[PDB]
Design a protein around this nucleic acid. Structure first.
Ligand SMILES: [Cl-]
Ligand SMILES: [Cl-]
Ligand SMILES: [Cl-]
Ligand SMILES: [K+]
Ligand SMILES: [Mg+2]
Ligand SMILES: [Mg+2]
Ligand SMILES: [Mg+2]
Ligand SMILES: [Mg+2]
Ligand SMILES: [Mg+2]
Ligand SMILES: [Mg+2]
Ligand SMILES: [Mg+2]
Ligand SMILES: [Mg+2]
Ligand SMILES: [Mg+2]
Ligand SMILES: [Mg+2]
Ligand SMILES: [Mg+2]
Ligand SMILES: [Mg+2]
Ligand SMILES: [Mg+2]
Ligand SMILES: [Mg+2]
Ligand SMILES: [Mg+2]
Ligand SMILES: [Mg+2]
Ligand SMILES: [Mg+2]
Ligand SMILES: [Mg+2]
Ligand SMILES: [Mg+2]
Ligand SMILES: [Mg+2]
Ligand code: NA
Ligand code: NA
Ligand code: NA
Ligand code: NA
Ligand code: NA
Ligand code: NA
Ligand code: NA
Ligand code: NA
Ligand code: NA
Ligand code: NA
Ligand code: NA
Ligand SMILES: [Sr+2]
Ligand SMILES: [Sr+2]
Ligand SMILES: [Sr+2]
Ligand SMILES: [Sr+2]
Ligand SMILES: [Sr+2]
Ligand SMILES: [Sr+2]
Ligand SMILES: [Sr+2]
Ligand SMILES: [Sr+2]
Ligand SMILES: [Sr+2]
Ligand SMILES: [Sr+2]
Lengths: 237, 119, 46, 194
RNA sequence: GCUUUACUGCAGGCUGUCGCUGAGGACUCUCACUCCGGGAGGAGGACACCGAUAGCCGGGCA
RNA sequence: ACUCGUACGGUCACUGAAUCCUGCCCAGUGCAGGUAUCUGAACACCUCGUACAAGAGGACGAAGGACCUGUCAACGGCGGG
RNA sequence: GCACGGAGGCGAAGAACCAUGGAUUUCCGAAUGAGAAUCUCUAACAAUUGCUUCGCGCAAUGAGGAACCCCGAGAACUGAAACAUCUCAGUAUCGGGAGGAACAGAAAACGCAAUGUGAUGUCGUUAGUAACCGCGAGUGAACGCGAUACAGCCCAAACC
């Protein structure tokens, strides 16, 4: 047959690319030698096209002006700190080791110094649970207990823009506008609605997959469609 | 470095090259890794020098053990070009051998002894 | 359109080639410009 | 008596034992960080180099080249093929890696001509060979009784036509009798069946 | 052209084994190699990646 | 490529606004998990064979299968007496 | 000049014409200072190399050529009265490269087994033989022999 849409994606052609030339900045934590003698002032709150959430522009002591992944409750004028000795307040960054247990955090690094990988989406947060000299235990937004190096840096508080998901798009046109700001091909044509040549589910008088949807993990690209390695399906049981 | 099992003091290395310099003006000396090698094999060698800045190391890796199973004493020189200069060459020399000193036997003897001690 | 200096030289040459076979060449050879082109009926290169 | 050279030779008969073993373990760390073709002042295996024609003289160059290990890196058929011509994974190329190495080296030094080459080991993902190249335009060589032959016009780009020792072996030209019915005088003249 | 529990194969995924690969049926370590870090250094570690091969799945493809 | 993205994410599918609802079936097929025992290739190992080799057999046994379990808003099914 | 016009001119200061050698030889073009649909902008071996007086100072490469030649990549229609091994075929086509011819070449050969031959191409033959093969269709040498032409040498190491 013909390659399915999932396969066209990988080629990274314009249709499937993200509007990167329009994206603002990479919100990675600052790199500090040590001492925490790094503080800056929030000079402005901006809209981040890539995340549909707000970001804050900060002017640091040493003259560096950079955008930062802002938690909820940060405003212009406010002073932020980044370092081992940073103060324990919303909007401040410091290694998990310095963070008191039971404190919601965001933009958590996976490997100390990577700039932040976890909990960066609208209104989300990781929950610092356990401390130690060898391992910091964090509860990520998905509910998973993640063991991290206590040297992994993070920002106190939850990500701004929470609740974004609580309101329905209502119109196709609204989805449309959001989609234009992401690396995604939209709208979506169902596999069952295509010709046999275009998808495993295509073909047949009436629409219906002519096979079970739960596909094996070992299936090759082009065939891995539907419910991938489902451990179960439905709502029952 | 892989064939070097002990470090020689700058001062000892100094005396050796001096001895080697008078050895060529008085007695006899071999210049070059090949000639140095045949001397040890023919047993016609009293003291063999081996530079430490030799690349590739294969060129002189054999001198150490070969000398041991031949009783011939050997010493290391930090630089290749010094040994060549001391041997009286306009170029460098990865290894050298004093084939019978000359009015330096006393010194060459001490040098060999100072090494055995240095292990 | 906007013609470059070179394009212009070529266009000019084509215009010149578009002339007739001199009358004397007729007498001399004792009896056509096979490359006669028309701006409308034809199409030049570029 | 034994030449000092024989000791380098003897060391390389078992590159995985003795001092040579530790040298390779050390060196390869540096080699893995070098480029595809690195010129070197002196051969790593002197005995082999001199044996292959090397000389400490102007116009003689040595370069270490690395190539990825394994079989062919081929793309599966996009058009119809019978089971036989659908193979992709176990199909290997007809030129050995040493030959690929000789060619890359010669491309890097367009003016030089490949004289010979030899192996200097490998790790799990690549192989290294050192190639001896000669400057056919340098007088120190135009006047050398043992190398001036490589200055002739018909020796130009010799490696690309399989005129190298590795080239000739790979073309099945070693045997002078049985087995060389389709290799000599050329693979091509024999319909490419060798 | 299309389909599939038609025939025969081919990609691909899973898995064992051999090489890369080191020291002291379960284990410690560091030195290759990998990853994080501007760097110091940190994490991991003879595994993983990669080469070779074996078994299974394999209209994704011929 | 996704991705200047990180689960309030984005990938793969099905249904197709709101409203009231969405029953029964895990035997077969699919997916996933588990698995005492059974089955399960090659290398190495052992026996026989060969002054060697081919080869024959053995022991060990991964995934997989047998077997067990979960799962239908998974393929689908919901009859005759 | 082709080219048989008109006008005019050149040639005994030996023109025309022919051979050999030299002069001139715009721009783009491998195209090489940078750029560009044959032009433009502000001293140029661009790029990769060797040597090196370490300065582009001295040099090399690049692109072309009817096919021939050498090294790589490598189909299908087709035949088998289907078709998968096989065939078509190492063909078509593709990548790289040399020359006037290429390539091969002085035995770790041959094995008419010998008290024998004696580098290598090629031609005739050996022969559709040996060998291969759903042992189907088909594929298919060699040694030798008769010819052509003949030619044999140089390193590495030992010892210096
Ligand atoms: Cl969305
Ligand atoms: Cl060449
Ligand atoms: Cl004979
Ligand atoms: K065929
Ligand atoms: Mg960022
Ligand atoms: Mg878009
Ligand atoms: Mg749809
Ligand atoms: Mg339709
Ligand atoms: Mg239709
Ligand atoms: Mg399909
Ligand atoms: Mg339907
Ligand atoms: Mg006009
Ligand atoms: Mg000579
Ligand atoms: Mg020929
Ligand atoms: Mg990296
Ligand atoms: Mg098909
Ligand atoms: Mg519908
Ligand atoms: Mg509809
Ligand atoms: Mg130009
Ligand atoms: Mg047929
Ligand atoms: Mg064939
Ligand atoms: Mg038949
Ligand atoms: Mg054939
Ligand atoms: Mg024969
Ligand atoms: Na026109
Ligand atoms: Na070259
Ligand atoms: Na063959
Ligand atoms: Na069922
Ligand atoms: Na001219
Ligand atoms: Na040039
Ligand atoms: Na220069
Ligand atoms: Na037929
Ligand atoms: Na047919
Ligand atoms: Na066959
Ligand atoms: Na006869
Ligand atoms: Sr990042
Ligand atoms: Sr970064
Ligand atoms: Sr269908
Ligand atoms: Sr239910
Ligand atoms: Sr030198
Ligand atoms: Sr018109
Ligand atoms: Sr060339
Ligand atoms: Sr509804
Ligand atoms: Sr079931
Ligand atoms: Sr002859």
């Amino acid at each position: 047959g013909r390659r399915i849409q999932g396969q066209r994606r990988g080629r990274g052609t314009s249709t499937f690319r993200a509007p990167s030339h329009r994206y603002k900045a990479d919100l990675e934590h600052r790199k500090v030698e040590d001492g925490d003698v790094i503080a800056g002032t929030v000079v402005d709150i901006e809209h981040d096209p890539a995340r549909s959430a707000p970001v804050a522009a900060v002017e640091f002591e040493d003259g560096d002006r950079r955008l930062i992944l802002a938690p909820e409750g940060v405003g212009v004028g406010d002073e932020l700190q980044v370092g081992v000795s940073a103060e324990i307040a919303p909007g401040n960054t410091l290694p998990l080791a310095e963070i008191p247990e039971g404190v919601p955090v965001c933009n958590v690094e996976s490997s100390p110094g990577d700039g932040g990988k976890f909990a960066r989406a609208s209104g989300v947060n990781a929950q610092l649970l356990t401390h130690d000299r060898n391992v910091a235990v964090v509860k990520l937004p998905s509910g998973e207990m993640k063991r991290l190096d206590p040297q992994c840096r993070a920002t106190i508080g939850v990500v701004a823009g929470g609740g974004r998901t609580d309101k329905p798009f209502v119109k196709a046109g609204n989805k449309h506008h959001k989609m234009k700001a992401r690396g995604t091909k939209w709208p979506n044509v169902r596999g069952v609605a295509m010709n046999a040549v275009d998808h495993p589910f295509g073909g047949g008088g009436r629409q219906h997959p002519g096979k079970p949807k739960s596909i094996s993990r070992n299936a090759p690209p082009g065939r891995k469609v539907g419910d991938i390695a489902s451990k179960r399906t439905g709502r029952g049981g | 470095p892989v064939y070097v099992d002990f470090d020689v003091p700058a001062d000892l290395e100094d005396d050796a090259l001096e001895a080697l310099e008078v050895a060529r003006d008085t007695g006899a000396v071999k210049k070059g890794t090949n000639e140095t090698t045949k001397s040890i094999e023919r047993g016609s060698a009293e003291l063999v020098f081996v530079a430490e800045d030799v690349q590739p190391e294969e060129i002189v890796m054999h001198i150490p053990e070969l000398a041991d199973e031949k009783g011939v004493p050997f010493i290391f020189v930090e630089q290749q070009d010094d040994l060549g200069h001391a041997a009286g060459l306009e170029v460098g020399s990865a290894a050298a051998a004093v084939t019978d000193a000359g009015e330096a036997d006393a010194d060459v003897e001490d040098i060999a002894d100072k090494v055995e001690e240095l292990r | 359109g906007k013609k470059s200096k070179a394009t212009k030289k070529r266009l000019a040459k084509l215009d010149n080639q578009n002339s007739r076979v001199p009358a004397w060449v007729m007498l001399k050879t004792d009896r056509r410009n096979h490359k006669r082109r028309h701006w409308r009926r034809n199409d030049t290169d570029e | 008596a034994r030449s000092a050279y024989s000791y380098i030779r003897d060391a390389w008969e078992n590159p995985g034992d003795g001092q040579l073993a530790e040298l390779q373990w050390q060196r390869q760390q540096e080699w893995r960080n070098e480029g595809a073709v690195e010129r070197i002042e002196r051969p790593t295996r002197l005995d082999k180099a001199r044996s292959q024609g090397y000389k400490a003289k102007q116009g003689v160059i040595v370069a270490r080249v690395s190539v990825r290990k394994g079989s062919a890196r081929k793309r599966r058929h996009k058009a119809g093929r019978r089971s036989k011509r659908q193979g992709v994974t176990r199909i290997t190329r007809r030129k050995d890696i040493q030959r690929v190495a000789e060619e890359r080296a010669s491309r890097t030094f367009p003016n030089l001509r490949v004289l010979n080459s030899y192996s200097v080991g490998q790790d799990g993902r690549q192989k290294w060979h050192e190639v001896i190249l000669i400057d056919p335009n340098h007088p120190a060589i135009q006047n050398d009784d043992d190398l001036s032959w490589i200055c002739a016009d018909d020796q130009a780009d010799r490696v690309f036509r399989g005129l190298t020792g590795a080239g000739r072996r790979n073309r099945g030209l070693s045997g002078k009798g049985k087995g060389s019915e389709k290799t000599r005088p050329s693979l091509r003249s024999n319909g490419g069946k060798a």
